[PDB]
Subunit: 279 residues, 3 copies
Amino acid sequence: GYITVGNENSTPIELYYEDQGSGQPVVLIHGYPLDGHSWERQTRELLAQGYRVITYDRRGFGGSSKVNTGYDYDTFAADLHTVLETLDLRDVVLVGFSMGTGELARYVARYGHERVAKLAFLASLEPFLVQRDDNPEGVPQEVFDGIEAAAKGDRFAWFTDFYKNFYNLDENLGSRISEQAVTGSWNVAIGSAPVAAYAVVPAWIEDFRSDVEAVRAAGKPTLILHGTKDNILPIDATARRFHQAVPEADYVEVEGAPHGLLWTHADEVNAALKTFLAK
Amino acid sequence: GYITVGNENSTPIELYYEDQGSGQPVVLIHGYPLDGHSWERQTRELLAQGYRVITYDRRGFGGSSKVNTGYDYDTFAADLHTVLETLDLRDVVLVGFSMGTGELARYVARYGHERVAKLAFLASLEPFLVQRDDNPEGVPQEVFDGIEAAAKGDRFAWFTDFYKNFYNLDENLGSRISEQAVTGSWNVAIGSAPVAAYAVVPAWIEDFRSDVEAVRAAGKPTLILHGTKDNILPIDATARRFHQAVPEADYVEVEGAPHGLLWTHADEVNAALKTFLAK
Amino acid sequence: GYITVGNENSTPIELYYEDQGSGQPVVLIHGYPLDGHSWERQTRELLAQGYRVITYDRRGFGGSSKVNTGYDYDTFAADLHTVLETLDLRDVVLVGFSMGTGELARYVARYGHERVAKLAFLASLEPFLVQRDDNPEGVPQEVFDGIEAAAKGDRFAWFTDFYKNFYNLDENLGSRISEQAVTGSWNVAIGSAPVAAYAVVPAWIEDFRSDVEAVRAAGKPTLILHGTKDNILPIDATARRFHQAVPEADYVEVEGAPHGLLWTHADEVNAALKTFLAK
């Protein structure tokens, strides 16, 4: 399916989406640089549990418009807003992974939470990833400058390097992810808009601290889940701070899990989501 | 092109299709887990012979909607019905390969054959693939349970394993199919809906014996063709039984050919189709 | 985005396109067998310079309709005409690479140049590639017969062989193009219509000499640029003849560059385009 969310010059900006099953709606918002099918090990379990599972592809990724403009969380949240309004979803469970955790918080901040039943943040960006004078816990800017330069420099070679760290392949290749599944991740990645490989870097490092205040003040059931061996989003720079800021959230650390834990630790992710959604 | 065949929640179910050439219409219905381009070695010959060649992609595959629902032959036949009605095709030659042989028989059973000139069944599922008390010639259920578990377990690794047996690669790699063509088959496969990798297993093993009665009673020119080294659909469990049940059909065994014979034995397939369509 | 340019039987022929930025419009027309994203190293620079950058995918390629008909430059030029009329582009800079250089010349010949500000021909087909009694400078027909047979014979293996010569991989693999970028080129190539792999061969070798007269007589700023180690379009059979025929054009030979110089020599291409567009 497609939902129109805007225009880029003479072209409509269309987000590809899938809408499956019946029951309470659950919207899964994928990470960089994948698409809605990256949720497959979660989707099939949620469908079996009697939820209506919707995924969509972020602008620039998967089946969505390969735009040049709007790679920022105000825009990504406006896109999500349009998806929820177009489908008129109520009592929705929002689930974000990696980049998708940004949509959840920015959406609540900008649009409120009348439509939202629950929020699940998996491998979160929050609260503020890049080190600044007022954010000493963050990661030095130079890391992101280097990533931006690599992704712009040759996105094809970059995605290979990125997935090594995404999945902790030295540890997990052949035990928790096959060579073929890694190749599938790469094939999806290179289909994204060339500019999207690096245009998202500034979005990743936006300050979400005020959005985290909105999320906490909403008082809706919230889950924060992270792998302890996440080498993309270091657990001390993200989830542990997010947990400190939102102590009411259910909190899960998946021992030994990498960033790419929807696949490598699908069982643990599924168990946490099953418990959380049953509340 | 796209033809709408239904809805899955808020999304239309759209089948991708191609409609080329001029002359008597011939509809080619591809096998798992490929798409309409898998017919390329046949398509170009039929076009050169002065036929109008139409292919479409089965739901879940190729360019068609990546649905969760309807992976069964009643639905696959209803999809075909909608394609034929939408395009208002008359005197059509239907040609199925592997899964596509199921559409042909179920379509005739459910909708009749007023629009149909001829039927060609290549690498057929018929008559009933899975062993049961009333179907002693079939293959034990455990084979299909294992396939379903592998395809659900990791579809990326599964497609690699599947294509080895699909093409008899130990025999044919480098002589009747290139490494690059195998890779092309895999790239197409992983684009299918994640759920479609395994959701089709129960469809493959449906009982087609009553549909075979409908096909035989139609009395339209019929071709049944199979490779003698088909390790996906064993010739004694399928084509030889189908031939016994429909003795009026033209019958071709392609000596030494695997399941993937549209590619590896394109010449033999083309020669059989040319003769058959000329009648 | 899509622009409808015709019909093939029951299906509209739709060209995929992207329309980005603001400023004077620049239309980039890709080479075989790639798509509009192959321009990525040029697109991002032109956008940064304040141009509106449009690319589209040639019929049969990339995201465009996978047709069987119209693989000839009269049709390719009519497609371009429809793109320019549909978007109502004025003062447009047309930039062609490899096959795209054919659209530029045939378009001016058939439709004039009222909408066109400037023309840039990169790795040009012009003036007439195949040797004939009245074209002694051309390449013997047998070369093209061999290519057509290889591309029809197994397009998957063919694209691998083609890209070796496209990029001069013996020289450039690992220094000016990564293995991963080569794989990205192959993944895009195999997505093209099966018939398009070889149907374009006769189009490549059309006589453009009368079109070159139209281009020269237009008197619009023109750039001709070619790599000196182009092993796909030999510089003496193409650019040097084109330069002799249109001496008013700006002329650039990129020392040591292969056919695939948008990627391998992006800096040199970008520098030439920046200078040319600034005029």
